[PDB]
């Protein structure tokens, strides 16, 4: 059961989660400029919402 | 006085080897040997000239030599190099290991060799600077800059850019697992200094006035966890040690001598010097968690050592078993236990260095790394396996080796303070025997027909045998006659223990 | 197998060695002989652990 | 107030550069020569650096109600001038291979220097607008310089629509604040009703496009791949260096920035900027997109200092030194990228897979990219580490535990791609102003090394400048 080292692998999951979450963020980028402006509107929406809950 | 020079010779030698790289190619090997000879000369001069048998109760501030210099005056960051007795043992050990590193790299010419040696002296000088460090920022800067040049060693010299397994897993885990915790202890340093700045009103980064800073309970506990996390990823402790076998199995075995024999020293040095005295009540509360992690480390490293099939990962998993004794030693209230840890720690370096030199030596003889593939090489090699038998014998508690007196005075002091966690701990010796015999029988006992490549074997040169003979005789004298270095470390160990006793 | 078994016995032997230093201080045989009854006026229960594990 | 000679000596940076545009434009119409225009433009920017000494003879004072000249603005004008000096020296080797009209380049960079040195000096909301747009119009037009490629025009058009959009958000926010307050002067502002705060959020949108913040970062890859590498030197360094000064001064002076309602929103943007930069930055195999990804994270570290500007006076020098270190690191890295394109070559083929080797091709230039690339990360012996160290100290000082933790874990994530490029320059291999371009990046390499090992003299300059 110790032919492969368990705790080295189970503390590598920060790197696994970071790399996979980084790949998802790269896939979130599109290149189509309409969604860039939609990102600007949706940042304005959340900033005003986050300011009105304060 | 001698301390600025004694941390700078490694950096000066790297500049000069790379300067004379244009002049010649056989120069940096001979330049590097002499420069490490000068390092041990100054280190041994401090051992002999200094009053190593000094007063056992001269307070917490006591130093044979001391250097101060303003570096960043806005926070009081100063080059506060100061050498104690046990710090001087650390310096002489790394000077000797540096001689072994530059001797194992002899007759190793490549496309570039001056780059390798300026990096080699840079990393060894970084460890010396950690060992002489009283200012917290200087300690942290040296702690983190010895950590960058080994990455280039594992990357460009783990294998010459052919396979991608020498960077993206081995070297990268080595780098991240240390630096995240280094930043953790930096913010721990800053939280401690800020609570001291509220108390008194001066921006200071010095150890003597941060030693007795007034802190309310429930506050210094978090800073003690913050110090211990960075001190638990460098020496192998139970939750975070996955970098160690990958780092040792991929770096060249000279880089592995640096990675095992002396990088493992500095964390327990910091647990003795920077974590115990600053946080007495937090460490007194945290003690039983440390004992549980210590016993788990010994048993865990031996099982993982028994279960492994290669050799570099095998000795790399002996190291995590060895350091569990040291951690239980530090987190107890006994003077004898701490003095056992020091001799165990010096012997740990001396018993890992010879094995790694010889494992690398065996690989370049046979061009095969897997242990179970070979077997029965005793009829072929003439001096490698006999000397290797004693080093595997010196790994466990065999008397006449320094490891026995080391681990075993810890157990005396540990049973003096607390019975039940010690009586669990002693059983690692039985487990130390089983992975020691597993190494010996799988590698050397058997028939040479286990491998086809075990039928044409080279000879062994004189200088490798010379540097193996010196280590085996040096390790036997430490096992038989350990009094001189215990008399050296008595006062430094004593005031740390008296402060840990009296401050609670 | 002999090596593993003899070191199990040596762990058992060193256990009594820790207990004797904790209880009676000096490990010399004769000084132990006329120090053992001086230290043992009150408690005796733990000496059987020392001696059984010495055995 | 009227014009006094004190005002003219204070205005000397905005003046020498403007006189340079006129002389450069007359010289273009006279001869249309590349050598004369490059010489005339670099002489004017060097004359602006010389005249920084003369405004240092003048104290902290106003010129008009639009501007306030302090010693803080002296340092920021200097950062912008060296970036303009840096971009013209990197453009001559790239533009020697350009087919025609090789002379409009320096005219636009000179206009952008006017815009940068106008956002250094700010005291009224209108000067904020005259500066943002003066620099955008060259950046509207210079990423579209050499439109003969299929992607330069693409990059120019994407940046054009988006930058006009941000300016329209900034202007609409700028007025919605002035509805409550009687004046738009930074100091006179705020003399927490929702319309002023709502107007403030609109200015954050219009400012966070150019500062490349988390929901506005989408332009920073594409134009950095599309623009010429000489333009990327200016677009990475000078624009955001100049822009960060005015957004810091607004929160320092305005009493509305003291309130926690704006503080929480900017902290979350800073938190997400570090994370949403350093996670998507790993997978890239293109060097220009790689530097554009790192820019988002560097501006995030600047924000985690800026949120604690109001708690402790160490944040002023912390922002200043990280900007100085960030300038030198990006100029060296982007200069090596542009120095690989010694001719125009049409579309330059630069990628992380295209940078195998490069030490046995050109060893000195590989060393500069490695030194700067380790300086971007946080490795010691480099000026980026001292800048990283102050922003950690500022976050510790102000008890922003989530934000300082984000920098550390962002550093932990972002170490990975910097190190690959550092080692990829060591795998197996697959004119006079060019030597001048090499001298600029080699000079920067020496500077970042000596100010990482020995960082005190740069702090003395910064505390000399800070008021």
Swiss-Prot record, chain B:
GO molecular function ontology, one term from the record: NADH dehydrogenase (ubiquinone) activity
Keyword Cytoplasm listed: no
Pfam families: Proton_antipo_M
Protein name in the entry: NADH-quinone oxidoreductase subunit M
Residue ranges annotated as Cytoplasmic topological domain: 22-29, 104-121, 195-221, 280-285, 335-339, 447-464
A GO CC term attached to the entry: respiratory chain complex I
Name of the coding gene: nuoM
Catalytic activity, as annotated: a quinone + NADH + 5 H(+)(in) = a quinol + NAD(+) + 4 H(+)(out)
Topological domains, Periplasmic: 51-82, 143-173, 243-258, 307-313, 361-382, 425, 486-504
Annotated compartments: Cell inner membrane
InterPro entries given in the database record: NADH_Q_OxRdtase_chainM/4, NADH_UbQ_OxRdtase, ND/Mrp_TM
Transmembrane portions of the chain: 1-21, 30-50, 83-103, 122-142, 174-194, 222-242, 259-279, 286-306, 314-334, 340-360, 383-403, 404-424, 426-446, 465-485
Topology versus the membrane: Multi-pass membrane protein
One record GO biological process: aerobic respiration
Cited function: NDH-1 shuttles electrons from NADH, via FMN and iron-sulfur (Fe-S) centers, to quinones in the respiratory chain. The immediate electron acceptor for the enzyme in this species is believed to be ubiquinone. Couples the redox reaction to proton translocation (for every two electrons transferred, four hydrogen ions are translocated across the cytoplasmic membrane), and thus conserves the redox energy in a proton gradient.
Swiss-Prot record, chain D:
Cellular localisation: Cell inner membrane
Any GO CC annotation of this UniProt entry: respiratory chain complex I
Topological region Periplasmic: 1-7, 56-70, 126, 180-195, 249-263, 311-318, 387-400, 460-467
Transmembrane spans: 8-28, 35-55, 71-91, 105-125, 127-147, 159-179, 196-216, 228-248, 264-284, 290-310, 319-339, 366-386, 401-423, 439-459
Mutant lacking the gene: phenotype: Cells gene grow very poorly on M65 minimal medium containing acetate but normally on rich medium (LB).
Phenotype for residue 388 to C: Shows 5% of the wild-type rate of deamino-NADH oxidase
Enzyme Commission number(s) of this protein: 7.1.1.-
Disulfide bonds: none
Membrane topology listed for this record: Multi-pass membrane protein
Effect of residue 384 to S: Shows 90% of the wild-type rate of deamino-NADH oxidase
Keyword check for Transcription regulation: no
Cell membrane is among the record's keywords: yes
Keywords of this entry: Cell inner membrane, Cell membrane, Membrane, NAD, Quinone, Translocase, Transmembrane, Transmembrane helix, Transport, Ubiquinone
Molecular function GO labels: NADH dehydrogenase (ubiquinone) activity; NADH:ubiquinone reductase (non-electrogenic) activity; quinone binding
Residue intervals on the Cytoplasmic side: 29-34, 92-104, 148-158, 217-227, 285-289, 340-365, 424-438
Domain of life: Bacteria
Reactions this protein catalyses: a quinone + NADH + 5 H(+)(in) = a quinol + NAD(+) + 4 H(+)(out)
GO biological process: aerobic respiration; ATP synthesis coupled electron transport; electron transport coupled proton transport; respiratory electron transport chain
NCBIfam families with a match to the protein in the record: NDH_I_N, PRK05777.1-1
Primary role: NDH-1 shuttles electrons from NADH, via FMN and iron-sulfur (Fe-S) centers, to quinones in the respiratory chain. The immediate electron acceptor for the enzyme in this species is believed to be ubiquinone. Couples the redox reaction to proton translocation (for every two electrons transferred, four hydrogen ions are translocated across the cytoplasmic membrane), and thus conserves the redox energy in a proton gradient.
Miscellaneous comment text of the record: A construct which produces a protein lacking the first amino acids has only 5% of the wild-type rate of deamino-NADH oxidase.
Matching HAMAP family: NDH1_NuoN_1 (MF_00445)
Quaternary structure (record): NDH-1 is composed of 13 different subunits. Subunits NuoA, H, J, K, L, M, N constitute the membrane sector of the complex.
Protein name according to UniProt: NADH-quinone oxidoreductase subunit N
Species in which this protein is naturally found: Escherichia coli (strain K12)
């Amino acid at each position: 059961l110790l032919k492969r080292d368990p705790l080295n692998s189970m503390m590598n999951i920060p790197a696994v989660l970071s790399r996979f979450a980084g790949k998802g963020l790269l896939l979130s980028e599109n290149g189509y400029l309409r969604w860039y402006v939609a990102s600007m509107s949706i940042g304005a929406v959340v900033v005003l919402a986050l300011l009105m809950v304060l | 006085m001698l301390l600025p020079w004694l941390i700078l010779i490694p950096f000066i030698g790297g500049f000069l080897c790379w300067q004379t790289e244009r002049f010649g190619v056989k120069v940096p090997r001979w330049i590097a040997l002499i420069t490490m000879g000068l390092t041990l000369a100054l280190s041994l001069q401090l051992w002999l000239q200094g009053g190593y048998s000094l007063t056992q109760s001269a307070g917490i501030p006591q130093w044979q030599s001391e250097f101060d210099m303003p570096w960043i005056p806005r926070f009081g960051i100063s080059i506060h190099l100061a050498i104690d007795g046990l710090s001087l043992l650390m310096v002489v050990l790394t000077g000797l290991l540096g001689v072994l590193a530059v001797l194992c790299s002899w007759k190793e010419i490549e496309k570039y060799q001056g780059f390798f040696h300026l990096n080699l002296m840079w990393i060894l000088g970084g460890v010396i600077g950690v060992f002489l460090a009283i200012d917290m920022f200087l300690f942290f800067f040296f702690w983190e800059m010895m950590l960058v040049p080994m990455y280039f060693l594992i990357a460009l010299w783990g294998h010459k850019a052919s396979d991608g397994k020498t960077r993206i897993t081995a070297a990268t885990k080595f780098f991240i697992y240390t630096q995240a915790s280094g930043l953790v202890m930096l913010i721990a340093i800053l939280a401690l200094v800020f609570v001291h700045y509220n108390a008194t009103g001066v921006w200071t980064f010095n150890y003597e006035e941060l030693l007795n800073t007034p802190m309310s309970s429930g506050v210094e506990y978090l800073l003690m966890l913050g110090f211990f996390i960075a001190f638990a990823v460098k020496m192998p402790v139970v939750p975070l040690h996955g970098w160690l076998p990958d780092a040792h199995s991929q770096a060249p075995t000279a880089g592995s001598v640096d990675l095992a024999g002396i990088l493992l020293k500095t964390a327990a040095y910091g647990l003795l010097r920077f974590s115990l005295p600053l946080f007495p009540n937090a460490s007194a509360e945290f003690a039983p968690i440390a004992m549980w992690l210590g016993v788990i480390g010994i048993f865990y490293g031996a099982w993982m050592a028994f279960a492994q099939t290669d050799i570099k990962r095998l000795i790399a998993y002996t190291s995590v078993s060895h350091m569990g004794f040291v951690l239980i030693a530090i987190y107890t209230g006994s003077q004898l236990a701490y003095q056992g840890a020091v001799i165990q720690m010096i012997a740990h370096g001396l018993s890992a260095a010879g094995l790694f030199i010889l494992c690398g030596q065996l690989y370049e003889r046979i061009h095969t790394r897997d242990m179970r593939m070979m077997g029965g090489l005793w009829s072929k090699m003439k001096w490698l396996p006999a000397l290797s038998l004693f080093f595997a014998v010196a790994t466990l508690g065999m008397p006449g080796t320094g490891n026995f007196v080391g681990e075993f005075m810890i157990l005396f002091g540990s049973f003096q303070v607390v019975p039940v966690i010690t009586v669990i701990s002693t059983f690692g010796l039985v487990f130390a025997s089983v992975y020691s015999l597993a190494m010996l029988h799988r590698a050397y006992f058997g028939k040479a027909k286990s491998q086809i490549a075990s039928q044409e074997l080279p000879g062994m040169s004189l200088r490798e045998l010379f540097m193996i003979l010196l280590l085996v005789v040096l390790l036997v004298l430490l096992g038989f006659y350990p009094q001189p270095i215990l008399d050296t470390s008595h006062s430094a160990i004593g005031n740390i223990q008296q402060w840990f006793v009296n401050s609670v | 197998k002999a090596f593993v078994v003899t070191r199990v016995g040596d762990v058992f032997l060193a256990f009594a060695l820790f207990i004797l230093y904790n209880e009676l201080g000096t490990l010399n045989f004769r000084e132990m002989v006329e120090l053992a009854p001086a230290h043992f006026a009150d408690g005796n229960n733990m000496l059987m652990w020392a001696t059984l594990m010495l055995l | 107030m009227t014009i006094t000679p004190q005002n003219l000596i204070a205005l000397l940076p905005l003046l020498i550069v403007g006189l340079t545009v006129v002389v450069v434009m007359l010289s273009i119409a006279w001869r249309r020569n590349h050598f004369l225009n490059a010489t005339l433009s670099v002489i004017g920017l060097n004359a602006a650096l010389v005249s920084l000494w003369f405004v240092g003879q003048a104290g902290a004072m106003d010129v008009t109600p639009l501007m306030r000249v302090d010693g803080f603005a002296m340092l920021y004008t200097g950062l912008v001038l060296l970036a303009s000096l840096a971009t013209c020296t990197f453009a001559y080797p790239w533009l020697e291979g350009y087919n025609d009209n090789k002379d409009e380049f320096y005219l636009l960079v000179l206009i952008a220097a006017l815009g940068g040195i106008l956002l250094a000096n700010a005291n009224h909301l209108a000067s904020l607008f005259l500066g943002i747009e003066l620099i955008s119009l060259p950046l509207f037009g210079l990423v579209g310089y050499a439109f003969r490629q299929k992607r330069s025009l693409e990059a120019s058009i994407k940046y054009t629509i988006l930058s006009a959009a941000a300016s329209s958000f900034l202007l609409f926010g700028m007025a919605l604040v002035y509805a409550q307050s009687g004046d738009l002067s930074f100091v006179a502002l705020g003399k927490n009703e929702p319309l002023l705060l709502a107007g403030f959020g609109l200015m954050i949108v219009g400012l966070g496009f150019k500062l490349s913040l988390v929901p506005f970062h989408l332009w920073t890859p594409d134009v950095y791949q599309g623009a010429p590498a000489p333009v990327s030197t200016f677009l990475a360094t000078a624009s955001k260096i100049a822009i960060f000064g005015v957004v810091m001064r607004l929160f320092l002076y305005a009493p509305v920035g003291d309130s926690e309602a704006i503080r929480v929103v900017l902290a979350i943007i800073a938190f997400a900027s570090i994370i949403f930069g350093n996670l998507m930055a790993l997978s890239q195999t293109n060097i220009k997109r790689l530097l554009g990804y790192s820019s988002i994270s560097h501006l995030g570290y600047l924000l985690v200092a800026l949120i604690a500007l109001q708690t402790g006076e160490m944040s002023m020098e912390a922002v200043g030194v990280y900007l100085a270190g960030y300038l030198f690191s990006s100029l060296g890295a982007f200069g090596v990228v542009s120095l690989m394109s010694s001719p125009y070559r049409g579309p330059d083929a630069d990628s992380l897979f295209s940078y195998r080797g490069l030490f046995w091709h050109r060893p000195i230039l590989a060393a500069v990219m490695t030194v700067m690339m380790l300086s971007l990360a946080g490795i010691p012996m480099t000026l980026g580490f001292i800048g990283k160290f102050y922003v950690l100290a500022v976050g510790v000082q102000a008890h922003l535990w989530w934000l300082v933790g984000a920098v550390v874990v962002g550093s932990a994530i972002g170490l990975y791609y910097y190190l690959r490029v550092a080692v990829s320059l060591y795998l197996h291999a697959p004119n006079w102003q060019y030597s001048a371009g090499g001298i600029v990046v080699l000079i920067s390499a020496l500077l970042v090394l000596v100010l990482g090992v020995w960082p005190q003299p740069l702090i003395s300059i910064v505390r000399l400048a800070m008021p």
